[PDB]
Design a protein around this motif. Structure first.
Motif, PDB file in Angstrom:
ATOM      1  N   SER A 242      29.283  43.006  35.272  1.00 41.42           N
ATOM      2  CA  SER A 242      30.125  44.032  35.406  1.00 41.42           C
ATOM      3  C   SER A 242      30.283  44.954  34.215  1.00 41.42           C
ATOM      4  O   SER A 242      29.930  44.432  33.283  1.00 41.42           O
ATOM      5  CB  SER A 242      31.455  43.366  35.752  1.00 41.42           C
ATOM      6  OG  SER A 242      32.153  42.792  34.622  1.00 41.42           O
ATOM      7  N   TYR A 243      30.657  46.060  34.347  1.00 42.58           N
ATOM      8  CA  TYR A 243      30.730  47.119  33.563  1.00 42.58           C
ATOM      9  C   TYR A 243      31.800  47.973  33.508  1.00 42.58           C
ATOM     10  O   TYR A 243      32.057  48.537  34.518  1.00 42.58           O
ATOM     11  CB  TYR A 243      29.419  47.929  33.339  1.00 42.58           C
ATOM     12  CG  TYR A 243      28.067  47.281  33.052  1.00 42.58           C
ATOM     13  CD1 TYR A 243      27.333  46.983  34.182  1.00 42.58           C
ATOM     14  CD2 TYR A 243      27.690  46.563  31.819  1.00 42.58           C
ATOM     15  CE1 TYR A 243      25.961  45.991  34.176  1.00 42.58           C
ATOM     16  CE2 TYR A 243      26.514  45.884  31.773  1.00 42.58           C
ATOM     17  CZ  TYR A 243      25.668  45.454  32.848  1.00 42.58           C
ATOM     18  OH  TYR A 243      24.691  44.802  32.717  1.00 42.58           O
ATOM     19  N   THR A 244      32.403  48.501  32.527  1.00 44.55           N
ATOM     20  CA  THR A 244      33.436  49.447  32.712  1.00 44.55           C
ATOM     21  C   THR A 244      33.074  50.916  32.347  1.00 44.55           C
ATOM     22  O   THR A 244      31.940  50.947  31.573  1.00 44.55           O
ATOM     23  CB  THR A 244      34.433  49.239  31.357  1.00 44.55           C
ATOM     24  OG1 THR A 244      35.252  48.025  31.526  1.00 44.55           O
ATOM     25  CG2 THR A 244      35.724  50.407  31.526  1.00 44.55           C
ATOM     26  N   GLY A 260      32.896  44.616  32.045  1.00 42.06           N
ATOM     27  CA  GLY A 260      33.862  44.932  32.912  1.00 42.06           C
ATOM     28  C   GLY A 260      35.307  44.013  32.922  1.00 42.06           C
ATOM     29  O   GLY A 260      35.002  43.185  31.863  1.00 42.06           O
ATOM     30  N   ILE A 261      36.260  44.373  33.490  1.00 42.68           N
ATOM     31  CA  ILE A 261      37.303  43.342  33.231  1.00 42.68           C
ATOM     32  C   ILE A 261      36.935  41.997  33.706  1.00 42.68           C
ATOM     33  O   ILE A 261      36.244  42.001  34.437  1.00 42.68           O
ATOM     34  CB  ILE A 261      38.686  44.029  33.866  1.00 42.68           C
ATOM     35  CG1 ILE A 261      38.419  43.981  35.244  1.00 42.68           C
ATOM     36  CG2 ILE A 261      39.050  45.320  33.155  1.00 42.68           C
ATOM     37  CD1 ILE A 261      39.795  44.176  35.995  1.00 42.68           C
ATOM     38  N   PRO A 262      37.915  40.886  33.201  1.00 47.27           N
ATOM     39  CA  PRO A 262      37.479  39.513  33.703  1.00 47.27           C
ATOM     40  C   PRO A 262      37.888  39.236  35.129  1.00 47.27           C
ATOM     41  O   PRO A 262      38.806  39.947  35.646  1.00 47.27           O
ATOM     42  CB  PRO A 262      38.090  38.809  32.521  1.00 47.27           C
ATOM     43  CG  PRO A 262      38.068  39.660  31.382  1.00 47.27           C
ATOM     44  CD  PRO A 262      38.406  41.013  31.868  1.00 47.27           C
ATOM     45  N   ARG A 264      39.441  36.911  37.925  1.00 48.32           N
ATOM     46  CA  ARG A 264      40.668  35.932  37.846  1.00 48.32           C
ATOM     47  C   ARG A 264      40.343  34.625  37.715  1.00 48.32           C
ATOM     48  O   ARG A 264      41.318  33.929  37.283  1.00 48.32           O
ATOM     49  CB  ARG A 264      41.367  36.271  39.470  1.00 48.32           C
ATOM     50  CG  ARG A 264      42.583  35.174  39.694  1.00 48.32           C
ATOM     51  CD  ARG A 264      43.061  35.756  41.067  1.00 48.32           C
ATOM     52  NE  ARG A 264      42.693  37.390  41.221  1.00 48.32           N
ATOM     53  CZ  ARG A 264      42.168  37.987  42.549  1.00 48.32           C
ATOM     54  NH1 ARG A 264      42.131  37.205  43.404  1.00 48.32           N
ATOM     55  NH2 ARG A 264      41.674  39.082  42.176  1.00 48.32           N
ATOM     56  N   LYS A 267      37.142  34.334  34.127  1.00 46.45           N
ATOM     57  CA  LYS A 267      37.670  34.820  33.018  1.00 46.45           C
ATOM     58  C   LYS A 267      36.458  34.890  31.604  1.00 46.45           C
ATOM     59  O   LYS A 267      36.686  34.191  30.717  1.00 46.45           O
ATOM     60  CB  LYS A 267      39.001  33.749  32.256  1.00 46.45           C
ATOM     61  CG  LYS A 267      40.164  33.990  33.033  1.00 46.45           C
ATOM     62  CD  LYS A 267      40.869  32.660  32.996  1.00 46.45           C
ATOM     63  CE  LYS A 267      42.330  32.868  33.890  1.00 46.45           C
ATOM     64  NZ  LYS A 267      42.594  31.653  34.392  1.00 46.45           N
ATOM     65  N   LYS A 269      34.498  38.389  29.972  1.00 44.55           N
ATOM     66  CA  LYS A 269      34.154  39.759  29.978  1.00 44.55           C
ATOM     67  C   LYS A 269      32.423  39.944  30.320  1.00 44.55           C
ATOM     68  O   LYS A 269      31.708  39.417  29.894  1.00 44.55           O
ATOM     69  CB  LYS A 269      34.522  40.566  28.808  1.00 44.55           C
ATOM     70  CG  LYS A 269      35.832  40.995  28.406  1.00 44.55           C
ATOM     71  CD  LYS A 269      35.912  40.862  26.839  1.00 44.55           C
ATOM     72  CE  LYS A 269      37.525  41.037  26.242  1.00 44.55           C
ATOM     73  NZ  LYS A 269      38.009  42.472  26.115  1.00 44.55           N
ATOM     74  N   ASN A 301      37.151  52.157  37.884  1.00 36.23           N
ATOM     75  CA  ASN A 301      36.177  52.468  36.779  1.00 36.23           C
ATOM     76  C   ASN A 301      35.372  51.098  36.607  1.00 36.23           C
ATOM     77  O   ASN A 301      34.954  51.075  35.508  1.00 36.23           O
ATOM     78  CB  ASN A 301      36.838  52.877  35.595  1.00 36.23           C
ATOM     79  CG  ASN A 301      37.817  51.777  34.943  1.00 36.23           C
ATOM     80  OD1 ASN A 301      38.079  50.546  35.537  1.00 36.23           O
ATOM     81  ND2 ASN A 301      38.012  51.970  33.570  1.00 36.23           N
ATOM     82  N   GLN A 302      35.068  50.240  37.712  1.00 34.48           N
ATOM     83  CA  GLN A 302      34.615  49.113  37.512  1.00 34.48           C
ATOM     84  C   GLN A 302      33.256  49.279  38.336  1.00 34.48           C
ATOM     85  O   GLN A 302      33.211  49.962  39.235  1.00 34.48           O
ATOM     86  CB  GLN A 302      35.388  48.019  38.084  1.00 34.48           C
ATOM     87  CG  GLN A 302      36.288  47.463  37.363  1.00 34.48           C
ATOM     88  CD  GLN A 302      36.208  47.197  35.820  1.00 34.48           C
ATOM     89  OE1 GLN A 302      36.134  48.301  34.976  1.00 34.48           O
ATOM     90  NE2 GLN A 302      35.951  46.231  35.352  1.00 34.48           N
TER      91      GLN A 302
END
Ligand SMILES: CC(=O)N[C@@H]1[C@@H](O)[C@H](O[C@@H]2O[C@H](CO)[C@@H](O[C@@H]3O[C@H](CO)[C@@H](O[C@@H]4O[C@H](CO)[C@@H](O[C@@H]5O[C@H](CO)[C@@H](O)[C@H](O)[C@H]5NC(C)=O)[C@H](O)[C@H]4NC(C)=O)[C@H](O)[C@H]3NC(C)=O)[C@H](O)[C@H]2NC(C)=O)[C@@H](CO)O[C@H]1O
Ligand code: NAG
Length: 361
Positions: A242-244, A260-262, A264, A267, A269, A301-302
């Motif tokens: 993933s990327y922000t 990207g955000i982690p 659930r 966990k 990045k 934004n992911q």
């Protein structure tokens, strides 16, 4: 066909359904299951987590339901000093101590072989990796004289051209290894400041400086280097990166603020398990690179580059068409192992899909 599946130590700590123990593994799924990773201590192979002795035991019992199942333990791995292996391998007194210590350990805990995941040697290290592989195999051969079935020896070899040239004497090591897993899934990452896929299967004429960053080139290169096809195993991921996003640009070449955000459950990045990706897809826009033959999805934004049943089957057909030894999965615990996140009431969707292509005409 061979189906090498890695199972990771640390996946037991994930909360809720994300928690995975050897238990959850369907014993007729893979041909080989590899446990990651082991430590090296006092120059000897040793356990990593507190409870490894128990999980080794859980994993090796799977062999009671399926006697043809081979299991292996993997030393090394990314969160392990590359420098540390280099220290063990260049000095003769240290390397022999490491070597002599492995058959006893594997026999005690009931593993059928060792997997070298040294990632990854620099150019000064190449001759030492060769010596490590040569002397280790020789030990496995000498140990078999006692009446036991020979221990298997494999290695996880990276896929970027520059990495291979720097430190692997592929022609030399193939003679001694039983199989080589090609890590065909790290062709992109946060380190580039742009969006992109980490496991394209084909070149895809959109970018022409990395004509080297796809599974097709890597497999051809390993073949030109002398690795026999019946020993080469293509790595297929079961996770996504993933990327922000740093703008509203969502297309090929779009910019990136970072990972990207982690998720659930995992966990971490910049990484998502396929079961987290199944949850993420709701209300996301799926897209698919036609040339490269792999999908990506984006929402908010992911931006996530991942693999699904179509891409994984495609990669599987590819390896069969080139007559490779099989496929390698990283990792069973990032696949939908319970089978309750990804719609269909099937378990290990991704791995069962790979197997389907390998099991047919
Ligand atoms: C075949 C091949 O070579 N494949 C490679 C492969 O290296 C790539 O995958 C990545 O590898 C690294 C390791 O090499 C992975 O790093 C993980 O990251 C985990 C999450 O951040 C981390 O989990 C933590 O593990 C700790 C154990 O060391 C846990 O500590 C424990 O806490 C428990 C309570 O939670 C407690 O009961 C325990 O007693 C305690 N024990 C300890 C510390 O031993 C910790 O809780 C746990 N959770 C956290 C902090 O989130 C792992 O430790 C770490 N692994 C290792 C060996 O250290 C990384 O996740 C892998 N990436 C992916 C995406 O899977 C791979 C990807 O490219 O493929 C090949 O390249
Ligand atoms: C593994 O071995 C190292 C070096 O011998 C030791 O210091 C360490 O405690 C071990 N690491 C872990 C994470 O268990």
């Amino acid at each position: 066909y061979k189906l090498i599946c890695y199972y990771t130590s640390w996946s037991q700590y994930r909360e809720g359904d994300g928690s995975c123990f050897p238990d959850a593994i369907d014993p007729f799924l893979c041909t080989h299951v590899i446990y990651s990773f082991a430590n090296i201590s006092n120059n000897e192979i040793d356990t990593w987590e507190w409870n490894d002795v128990t999980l080794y035991d859980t994993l090796n019992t799977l062999k009671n339901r399926n006697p043809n199942l081979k299991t292996l333990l993997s030393v090394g791995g990314w969160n392990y000093g590359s420098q540390r292996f280099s220290k063990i391998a260049s000095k003769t007194q240290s390397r022999r101590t490491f070597i002599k210590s492995v058959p006893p350990f594997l026999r005690t805990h009931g593993f059928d072989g060792l997997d070298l995941a040294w990632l990854w040697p620099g150019w000064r290290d190449k001759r030492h990796l060769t010596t490590l592989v040569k002397e280790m195999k020789a030990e496995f051969v000498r140990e078999a004289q006692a009446g036991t079935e020979q221990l298997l020896l494999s290695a996880a070899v990276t896929a970027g051209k520059i990495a291979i040239d720097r430190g692997y004497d592929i022609a030399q090591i193939s003679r001694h290894l039983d199989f080589i897993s090609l890590l065909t899934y790290d062709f992109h990452g946060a380190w580039r400041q742009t969006v992109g896929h980490h496991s394209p299967l084909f070149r895809g004429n959109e970018d022409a400086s990395s004509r080297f960053s796809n599974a097709d080139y890597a497999v051809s290169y390993m073949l030109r280097l002398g690795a026999p096809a019946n020993k080469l195993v293509m790595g297929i991921p079961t996770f996504g990166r993933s990327y922000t996003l740093a703008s509203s640009k969502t297309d090929v070449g779009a910019p990136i603020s970072g990972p990207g955000i982690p998720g659930r459950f995992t966990k971490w990045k910049g990484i998502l398990a396929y079961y987290e990706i199944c949850d993420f897809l709701h209300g996301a826009t799926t897209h698919r690179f036609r040339d490269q033959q792999v999908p990506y999805a984006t929402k908010g934004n992911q931006w996530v580059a991942y693999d699904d049943q179509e891409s994984v089957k495609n990669k599987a057909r590819y390896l069969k068409n080139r007559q490779l030894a099989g496929a390698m999965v990283w990792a069973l615990d990032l696949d939908d192992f319970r089978g309750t996140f990804c719609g269909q009431n099937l378990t290990f969707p991704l791995t069962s899909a790979i197997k389907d292509v390998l099991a047919r005409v």
